[PDB]
Amino acid sequence: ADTATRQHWMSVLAHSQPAELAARLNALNITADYEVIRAAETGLVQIQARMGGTGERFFAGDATLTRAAVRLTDGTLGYSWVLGRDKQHAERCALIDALMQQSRHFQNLSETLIAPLDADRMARIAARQAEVNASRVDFFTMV
Amino acid sequence: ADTATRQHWMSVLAHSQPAELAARLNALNITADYEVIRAAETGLVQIQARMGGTGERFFAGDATLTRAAVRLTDGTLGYSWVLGRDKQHAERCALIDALMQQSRHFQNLSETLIAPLDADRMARIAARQAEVNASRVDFFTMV
Amino acid sequence: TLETAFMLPVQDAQHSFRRLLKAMSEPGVIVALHQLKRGWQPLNIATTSVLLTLADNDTPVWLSTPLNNDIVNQSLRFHTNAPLVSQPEQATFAVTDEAISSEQLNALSTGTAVAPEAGATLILQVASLSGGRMLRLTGAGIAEERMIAPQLPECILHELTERPHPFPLGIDLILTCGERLLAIPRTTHVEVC
Amino acid sequence: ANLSGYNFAYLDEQTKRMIRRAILKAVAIPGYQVPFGGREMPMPYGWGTGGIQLTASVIGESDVLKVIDQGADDTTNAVSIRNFFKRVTGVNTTERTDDATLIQTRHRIPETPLTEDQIIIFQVPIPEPLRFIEPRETETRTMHALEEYGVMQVKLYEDIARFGHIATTYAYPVKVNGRYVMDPSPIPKFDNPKMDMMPALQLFGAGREKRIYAVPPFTRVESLDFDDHPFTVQQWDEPCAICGSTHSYLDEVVLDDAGNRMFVCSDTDYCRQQSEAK
Amino acid sequence: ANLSGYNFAYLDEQTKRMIRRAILKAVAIPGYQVPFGGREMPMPYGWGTGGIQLTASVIGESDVLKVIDQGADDTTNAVSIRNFFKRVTGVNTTERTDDATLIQTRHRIPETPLTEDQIIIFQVPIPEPLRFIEPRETETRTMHALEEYGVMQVKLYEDIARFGHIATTYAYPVKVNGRYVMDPSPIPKFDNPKMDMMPALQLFGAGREKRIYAVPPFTRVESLDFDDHPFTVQQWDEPCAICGSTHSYLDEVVLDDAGNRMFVCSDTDYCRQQSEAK
Amino acid sequence: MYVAVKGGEKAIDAAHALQESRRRGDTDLPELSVAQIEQQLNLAVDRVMTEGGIADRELAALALKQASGDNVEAIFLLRAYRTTLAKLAVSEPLDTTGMRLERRISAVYKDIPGGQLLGPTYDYTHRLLDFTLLANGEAPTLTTADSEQQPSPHVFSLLARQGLAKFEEDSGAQPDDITRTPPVYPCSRSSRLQQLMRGDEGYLLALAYSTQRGYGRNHPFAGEIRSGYIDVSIVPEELGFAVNVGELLMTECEMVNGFIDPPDEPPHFTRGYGLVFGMSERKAMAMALVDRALQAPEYGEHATGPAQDEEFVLAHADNVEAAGFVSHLKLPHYVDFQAELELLKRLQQEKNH
Amino acid sequence: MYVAVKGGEKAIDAAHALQESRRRGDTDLPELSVAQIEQQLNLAVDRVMTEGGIADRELAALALKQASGDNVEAIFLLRAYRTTLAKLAVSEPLDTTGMRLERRISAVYKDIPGGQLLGPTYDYTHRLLDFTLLANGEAPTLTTADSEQQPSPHVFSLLARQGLAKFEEDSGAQPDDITRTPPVYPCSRSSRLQQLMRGDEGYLLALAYSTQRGYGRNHPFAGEIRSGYIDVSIVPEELGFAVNVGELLMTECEMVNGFIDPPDEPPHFTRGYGLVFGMSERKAMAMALVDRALQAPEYGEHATGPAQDEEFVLAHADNVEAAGFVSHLKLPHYVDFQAELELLKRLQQEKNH
Numbered sequence A, B: 001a002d003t004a005t006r007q008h009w010m011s012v013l014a015h016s017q018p019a020e021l022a023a024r025l026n027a028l029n030i031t032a033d034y035e036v037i038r039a040a041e042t043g044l045v046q047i048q049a050r051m052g053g054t055g056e057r058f059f060a061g062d063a064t065l066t067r068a069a070v071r072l073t074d075g076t077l078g079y080s081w082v083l084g085r086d087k088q089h090a091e092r093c094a095l096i097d098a099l100m101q102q103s104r105h106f107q108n109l110s111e112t113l114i115a116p117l118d119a120d121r122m123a124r125i126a127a128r129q130a131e132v133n134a135s136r137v138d139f140f141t142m143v
Numbered sequence C: 001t002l003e004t005a006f007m008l009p010v011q012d013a014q015h016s017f018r019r020l021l022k023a024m025s026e027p028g029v030i031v032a033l034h035q036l037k038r039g040w041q042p043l044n045i046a047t048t049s050v051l052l053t054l055a056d057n058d059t060p061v062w063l064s065t066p067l068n069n070d071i072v073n074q075s076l077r078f079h080t081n082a083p084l085v086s087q088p089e090q091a092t093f094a095v096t097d098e099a100i101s102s103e104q105l106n107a108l109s110t111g112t113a114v115a116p117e118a119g120a121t122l123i124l125q126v127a128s129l130s131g132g133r134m135l136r137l138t139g140a141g142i143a144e145e146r147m148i149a150p151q152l153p154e155c156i157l158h159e160l161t162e163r164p165h166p167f168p169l170g171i172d173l174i175l176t177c178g179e180r181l182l183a184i185p186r187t188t189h190v191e192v193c
Numbered sequence D, E: 001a002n003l004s005g006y007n008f009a010y011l012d013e014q015t016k017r018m019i020r021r022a023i024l025k026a027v028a029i030p031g032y033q034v035p036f037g038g039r040e041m042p043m044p045y046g047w048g049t050g051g052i053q054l055t056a057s058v059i060g061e062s063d064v065l066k067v068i069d070q071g072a073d074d075t076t077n078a079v080s081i082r083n084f085f086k087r088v089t090g091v092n093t094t095e096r097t098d099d100a101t102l103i104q105t106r107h108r109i110p111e112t113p114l115t116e117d118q119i120i121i122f123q124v125p126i127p128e129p130l131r132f133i134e135p136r137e138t139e140t141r142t143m144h145a146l147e148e149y150g151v152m153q154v155k156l157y158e159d160i161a162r163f164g165h166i167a168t169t170y171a172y173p174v175k176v177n178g179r180y181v182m183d184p185s186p187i188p189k190f191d192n193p194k195m196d197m198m199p200a201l202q203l204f205g206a207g208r209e210k211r212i213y214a215v216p217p218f219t220r221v222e223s224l225d226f227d228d229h230p231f232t233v234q235q236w237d238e239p240c241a242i243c244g245s246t247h248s249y250l251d252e253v254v255l256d257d258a259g260n261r262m263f264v265c266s267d268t269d270y271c272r273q274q275s276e277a278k
Numbered sequence F, G: 001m002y003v004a005v006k007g008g009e010k011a012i013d014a015a016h017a018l019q020e021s022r023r024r025g026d027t028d029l030p031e032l033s034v035a036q037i038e039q040q041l042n043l044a045v046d047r048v049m050t051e052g053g054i055a056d057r058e059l060a061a062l063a064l065k066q067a068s069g070d071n072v073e074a075i076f077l078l079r080a081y082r083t084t085l086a087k088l089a090v091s092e093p094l095d096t097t098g099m100r101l102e103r104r105i106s107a108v109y110k111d112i113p114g115g116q117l118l119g120p121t122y123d124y125t126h127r128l129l130d131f132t133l134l135a136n137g138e139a140p141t142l143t144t145a146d147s148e149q150q151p152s153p154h155v156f157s158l159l160a161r162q163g164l165a166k167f168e169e170d171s172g173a174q175p176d177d178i179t180r181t182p183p184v185y186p187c188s189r190s191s192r193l194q195q196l197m198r199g200d201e202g203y204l205l206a207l208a209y210s211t212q213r214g215y216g217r218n219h220p221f222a223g224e225i226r227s228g229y230i231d232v233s234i235v236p237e238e239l240g241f242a243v244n245v246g247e248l249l250m251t252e253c254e255m256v257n258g259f260i261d262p263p264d265e266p267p268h269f270t271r272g273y274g275l276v277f278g279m280s281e282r283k284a285m286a287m288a289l290v291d292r293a294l295q296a297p298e299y300g301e302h303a304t305g306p307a308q309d310e311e312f313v314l315a316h317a318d319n320v321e322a323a324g325f326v327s328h329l330k331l332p333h334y335v336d337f338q339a340e341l342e343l344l345k346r347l348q349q350e351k352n353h
């Protein structure tokens, strides 16, 4: 379940708005010494799609992808792959990924950094879904 | 030569920037009672072009055209046909066209309204021509 | 000096068109065009209403000599812009009275096989729509049959009965009497009863 | 009333008059595609511009307008067109077929029989019934002029030889007044019989393709078929799930991902009448 | 030097290596259009991308680059390409043919004979000499594979029968190494002889069409012609108005609206050399 | 049991509100002004004017803003707005020799009378994304040369005077107007050019490109491309003499094409013509190329590409029609599809019998 | 006598400065921001992303700003920028069933599981120019419904379960990549779809429209159009398990096409597929229509329209290539034209002899 947890928090960081993550990390005032293994680099992720949504693969263009990697003093490696071109955001995501692998930070960050971010994204999504569902065409109602 | 003079001042009014004409007419403080024969109306002028620039006619789309007409107390009729949709500008152009047909106003307006407007347009044109001519490609110079 | 057109051009033209559409789609049915109160004499109310509804700069109009009057021409030009042509073959709308000749009738455009709509519509002013030789009409627009008795010229009756022009070619006939009119399209089978 | 700043019915009088002349010519030449100088509407080409122009050229203040799409008044495009006409004319509107003086429709003829003085206006994408056999107008025009309809008969016979049935299921070609092969618009074959000897005037507008044609009242309209493969209309094993009718064109509503579906009348006014009768 | 933030010569190493393998294959197969996975450049397709990619894949720090268009270094596109290469490589550049190690050209071969170790890189719109006879690659590929060149010979013979002359005046097809019919790029017929048994290596890039081909040094290049209609180069009644040369391709400069014109060498470096000699 | 409910009107209103909110976007950002689009997105405006049929920059920018930058939707908006306006006049024929030049180039001669005037162009730029545009910057202070416009005769006039090309003569033929009468194939060149000017830029560009690749080759050279201000004049019935109503920014392209050798005259270059509103040129070039391609019947040319197929090209050129009809598939089609389904189910049952 | 002078570089610099000044426009107006273009001209951005090959809204808006709204120039800018970037990963195949829906409609059934979700659309709007946009306004306060997204299975899945259509099966074939190897005709469907996604919107729209008018008919019904956010995942070599790198706004179109009766299986509907970045749909619809048209060799169909001619369609679809080659005629061509002139003058002299 460790891999699933790492995937989940990396996902949450990858989907976070850079501004909110930066604000939340500044507020938590985490003191951690790290060195950048791989400087935040912006390149492309080639998008594979499927014929008919389910069939043979074909290349549906590319998207911008920024990747970063850091190492902590104890050797823990943090990584980040986020769509877009925000190098600072990628560095922050990699730092949080490294920290979340340390027993001293996993619980605290999960309660105060990751869960809050996921909840905010879910709230925004729910609001947008309500607005969109206003446009649903009603035809029949069961009596 | 009267028709040429009327064409010239109508042209000058038609090519004038509405703001400068409005400012210049406000400044001249011309007291003239007039009634609008035709309320400023915006429609289309169909553009006829020529094959190869010189041959058979063909219709190259349309452009917006605003027309206005006024009558002075003495029966003089002023008219205006200007590209665009500025009804107030068309009314002003028609009023000036009516006034310019009155002997009491022709000389004064020509010296203080029409000539100044034409000179300003020519100056703007000359400046733009200088800027554009900066892009001319030089190949040979006669020695 | 010029005659007066519809008092409410939009609404009156629409009403007249709907009446004329009823007439053309149901041949032999008499309709009344009441919007215009005085026709441009010698043009009757129905003829003038049809011209005001349909005629314009795109539709040349030919008026036969008995119906060609300077005031009528000036009013038509002013109220519709419709160009007035002196030759029947150049007309989209042809206006005539009982005195229409066979030559003028045969001069009218019938359209072509590929462009059957490119012909002329004949507005004929009849003395009466009720006291002529009884005609039995069959075809499109008529459920079983319809019996009329307009007072028609011999040439017009020959045109209707014999149909020299092969379908889809042919002229569409609008018979006008006062404020009333009836329509016989090229498709109507006409038998002298 | 009309209180939107536009001319009544949104068309200038010149366009109305041109369209009216086209309508009269179409009536006089049943089934023949009359070209007309149609204009761009607030609806995109292919969203009913021809029907809109026809209705605008025929409609008056006392008309009661019914607009339907797929047989339903509440369809998105039906609502759009009807709201547009309410804005630019102010005419009374109805969902009841028997109270409508003008019926503008897309792909259905109402189950309720039409009556004298009613006009039904069809929205037509492809006014040329030979288009899918012969894509070029330069050829189909001549074929209509010369009554050269063999490619259509060959298409039907080849369809029978290949599949055992005529492949066309909607916009089924029809011979009008014994002469003209006409496209009845994208109505399902179920509706084609209603066109034969109908007391109402039928108008057909193809705005994008710039054609108007007409079937006058009480005109023969016969679907092309064979004696041993006679014209047959759509059938369903189920009645309407709401009103129980077995005589109406049915639309298939997919209820769940597990394959559960129901069938309900496409003609919602007819469905309401049937439901109120029971 | 390269101080622009881009890799040397602006191409990533993978693209350079792919193009280099393509160049080697092209050299080993003279006249054959080698497909290659070309990339979009800062110049639009059709503005020299193939030549740009070839030069980027071959150029080094010690190379002296000459870029010409219509035979002139100062042409707009020549200036653009040369400035781009100065930005992304920092290489020395020259207008002198005899001092250039790399010559990238559009539509001219310099009058000054090329020498060993020089590489001339042609910009090619249409790498297929049969394209205007046969628009489809699916056919021209097979024709090159099977050496089925009859349509070209028929084109030439029909041209002679119609006009009395071969109609093609630039991009004149040439047989290379006795086997491959090749497009020499849109150089005038005047330049085709220079391609035969030349000490320099000739490279040809069609970026939009994704082809690279080559003529190694000292390779036979023979323009397709007839014995009684032999290959003839462009001629003019006037010499160069500047240097007086009668042996150079001339460009016609229209001086005034009254029909006054002059003729001047297309090869501006050659013209400067001739003017300095006199 | 199931009961029908009304949902169309409210769903439509909600959808339109959603689209309007998306068009506004983040309210923290200032709302775009039509003036800003007109000034700084001027090439999109040029395309919208040319294909919408109205040469009013402000209206085109308004349509673009309303269309959320969708050029097709904006073109349709302008085209539809055209229908609501009255035709107050018909211009006298344009005289492109009087154009006040912003740009004038010729590919067929190194230098020409009047010179190669590049003007404002993206030609010869290195298409490297300029990230400094992510923040406010300063436009370059333009250098200045002499203000006089040198005589710039049309290159085709210089060709024709030599006998290399044929002057385009005016016989007084009345132009066809496809805005008033539907096209009748084969169309006159006037109708074809009117339709091409209104045609989809991408479609015509692809057709011209195919012609360059051998599918109906016309051996084109860019004889002259001019972009500048041309005066518009009318003759009102009120006054009876010509009045200048202003000027329009237009681009004109004259292409030299493949020469021909007619039986009873010297061989000469053929030619194509393109004319558009604004500065965007490639529409004019493609229009000239496709115009030459559609000239095939005049020259007895055997068609080798779809660009020479008049009906195929013109019937599908107008993106108002094409976009509308392709989008109409989004409309409910379930009656039709039910008609298809019934047939298919019967066919399957019969095959499986 | 005449002496050559250097004019190319300074003329080019002046031309580029002129274009930059025109792009800035009237300095009294605030300079457009890339964020504003991204938010309020989002459909243009969608087109630029789809055809430029990079799904980065900010970069597409930057290209549009730099291109003065010229969609073709912006597409080329983004496409060129692609060349400077490294491929850091290849995504796992997209799974459109996981899309977070902004819009979902189906024309083949009145109502479907998950409902007809119109979302933000201009469909059913009356295209009347909204002059209130000439000044600042207030966006509508959106009404709200339940926030839950109902299950929205693909309509083609419901078709295939009935046996009316065929599931698109994955055999594991390696997709062709036309960005690394030039296309080889006939191309696989993967290559054809990759090219169609990059193709000119107008060209493909016109081709699809021609197919609707009988030039290679495919009897299309809009089986389903979805627009929404789809998650992108990769498998980095560093970690060896899948990571979600974010989500992209994409539109997917599945077209039901004319049924076929194969020798040894029940007759079934054919189908077409379209996929684009952003909300703009008509590109996806045209892509599906042309994909079905180019499926002709698979189904042994006799071609009746250019839309079925694979080489003609695909070789001229990319507007980067087409626009570049049409514009290249603006380049100096006087050497070739001189050769042409020499031949023509000799022909005239010989004829006049």
Ligand SMILES: O=P(O)(O)OC[C@H]1O[C@@H]2OP(=O)(O)O[C@@H]2[C@@H]1O
Pocket (backbone or CB within 6 Å): D044, D045, D046, D047, D048, D049, D050, D051, D106, D123, D124, D125, D126, D186, D205, D206, D207, D208, D209, F328, F331
């Ligand atoms: O050309 P228009 O604008 O008059 O639209 C006519 C018809 O074309 C489309 O195809 P459809 O039959 O599915 O329904 C739509 C519309 O009703």
Ligand SMILES: O=P(O)(O)OC[C@H]1O[C@@H]2OP(=O)(O)O[C@@H]2[C@@H]1O
Pocket (backbone or CB within 6 Å): E044, E045, E046, E047, E048, E049, E050, E051, E106, E123, E124, E125, E126, E186, E205, E206, E207, E208, E209, G328, G331
């Ligand atoms: O495809 P590319 O980008 O490599 O451009 C090759 C050639 O295509 C155009 O045609 P051209 O011969 O006139 O000159 C241009 C250019 O040099």
Ligand SMILES: [Zn+2]
Pocket (backbone or CB within 6 Å): D240, D241, D242, D243, D244, D245, D248, D264, D265, D270, D271, D272, D274
């Ligand atoms: Zn029911």
Ligand SMILES: [Zn+2]
Pocket (backbone or CB within 6 Å): E240, E241, E242, E243, E244, E245, E248, E264, E265, E270, E271, E272, E274
């Ligand atoms: Zn010289």
Ligand SMILES: [Zn+2]
Pocket (backbone or CB within 6 Å): D125, F328, F329, F333
């Ligand atoms: Zn449809």
Ligand SMILES: [Zn+2]
Pocket (backbone or CB within 6 Å): E125, G328, G329, G333
């Ligand atoms: Zn070229």
